[PDB]
Amino acid sequence: ARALDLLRGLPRVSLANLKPNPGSKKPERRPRGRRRGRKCG
């Protein structure tokens, strides 16, 4: 694992570094604004 040596130079993982996997969280689509809500779908 070369990836663990990359962890040495990075700062420590806190609860302020966390990020879900890209694709795991979809954006919630809510009816405000010109596109999403006029008759709101």
Partner 1 sequence: RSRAYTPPEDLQSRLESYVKEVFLPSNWQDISLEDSRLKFNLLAHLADDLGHVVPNSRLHQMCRVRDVLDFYNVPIQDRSKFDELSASNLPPNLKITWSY
Partner 2 sequence: PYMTREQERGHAAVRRREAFEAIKAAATSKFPPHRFIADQLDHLNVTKKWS
Residues that bind partner 1 (CB under 8 A): 4-5, 7-8
The total number of residues shown for the chain amounts to: 41
- DSSP category for residue 7: H
**Residue 7: CB minimum distance to partner 1, A:** 8
Can you read off the two tokens belonging to residue 13? 């993982």
| Partner that binds at residue 4, options partner 2, partner 1, none, CB closer than 5 to 8 Å by kind | partner 1
Distance CA 39, CA 41 (A): 6
Nearer to partner 1, 9 or 41 (CB): 9
**Residue 12: CB minimum distance to partner 2, A:** 8
